[PDB]
Design an enzyme around this catalytic site. Structure first.
Site, mmCIF file in Angstrom:
data_model
loop_
_atom_site.group_PDB
_atom_site.id
_atom_site.type_symbol
_atom_site.label_atom_id
_atom_site.label_comp_id
_atom_site.label_asym_id
_atom_site.label_seq_id
_atom_site.Cartn_x
_atom_site.Cartn_y
_atom_site.Cartn_z
ATOM 1 N N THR A 87 0.815 -1.220 0.000
ATOM 2 C CA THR A 87 0.000 0.000 0.000
ATOM 3 C C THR A 87 0.850 1.272 0.000
ATOM 4 O O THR A 87 0.530 2.212 -0.718
ATOM 5 C CB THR A 87 -1.016 -0.082 1.150
ATOM 6 N N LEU A 133 -6.988 -0.295 -4.943
ATOM 7 C CA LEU A 133 -5.633 -0.474 -4.432
ATOM 8 C C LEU A 133 -5.624 -1.071 -3.015
ATOM 9 O O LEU A 133 -4.917 -2.042 -2.766
ATOM 10 C CB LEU A 133 -4.938 0.894 -4.550
ATOM 11 N N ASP A 134 -6.436 -0.546 -2.100
ATOM 12 C CA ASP A 134 -6.529 -1.030 -0.717
ATOM 13 C C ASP A 134 -7.484 -2.211 -0.486
ATOM 14 O O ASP A 134 -7.413 -2.817 0.577
ATOM 15 C CB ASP A 134 -6.940 0.133 0.207
ATOM 16 N N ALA A 135 -8.340 -2.597 -1.434
ATOM 17 C CA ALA A 135 -9.324 -3.668 -1.263
ATOM 18 C C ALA A 135 -8.788 -4.970 -0.642
ATOM 19 O O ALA A 135 -9.254 -5.381 0.419
ATOM 20 C CB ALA A 135 -10.000 -3.940 -2.608
ATOM 21 N N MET A 191 -7.042 -4.437 2.943
ATOM 22 C CA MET A 191 -8.012 -4.345 4.031
ATOM 23 C C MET A 191 -8.631 -5.699 4.383
ATOM 24 O O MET A 191 -8.952 -5.929 5.544
ATOM 25 C CB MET A 191 -9.084 -3.303 3.700
#
Lengths: 83, 48
Positions: free
Chosen positions: A23, A59-61, A64
């Site tokens: 990230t 990008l963060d899916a 997380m």
């Protein structure tokens, strides 16, 4: 129980650590291109900022999901119940 | 000579060589572009 619990701490460190690593490099790449476009055409900034947040969600899916599984392995434990 | 009007031609001397919030996407380098455009400008002034 001792080695399953000891190896769950390392499993949590790899989930959060690899997610933090990816990230930070990913936003460094996406972010540099937002500033480059914003400097060349300062009138486009309102559009480019909205388009950046559409990418930021993709990008963060998976990162997380990894942080969600790591907190689950820390405050509960699905492996300890399997002996 | 310069065309002041249909009844008046004026002899003149004009200098040729010695001459805001965004920037261009220069395809070749900006130096290469400046070298070619200054030449086209001087030729166009001579043609005019």
């Amino acid at each position: 129980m001792e080695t399953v619990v000891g190896l769950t701490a390392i499993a949590v460190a790899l989930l959060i650590g690899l997610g933090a690593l990816g990230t930070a490099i990913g936003f460094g790449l996406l972010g540099g291109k937002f500033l480059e476009g914003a400097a060349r055409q300062p009138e486009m900034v309102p559009m480019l900022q909205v388009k950046m947040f559409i990418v930021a969600g993709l990008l963060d899916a998976v990162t997380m999901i990894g942080v969600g599984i790591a907190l689950f392995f820390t405050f509960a434990n699905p492996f300890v119940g399997q002996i | 000579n310069k065309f002041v009007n249909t009844m008046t031609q004026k002899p003149t001397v004009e200098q040729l060589i010695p001459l805001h919030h965004w920037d261009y996407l220069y395809e070749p380098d900006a130096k290469s572009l400046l070298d070619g455009l200054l030449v086209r400008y001087v030729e166009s002034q001579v043609y005019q």
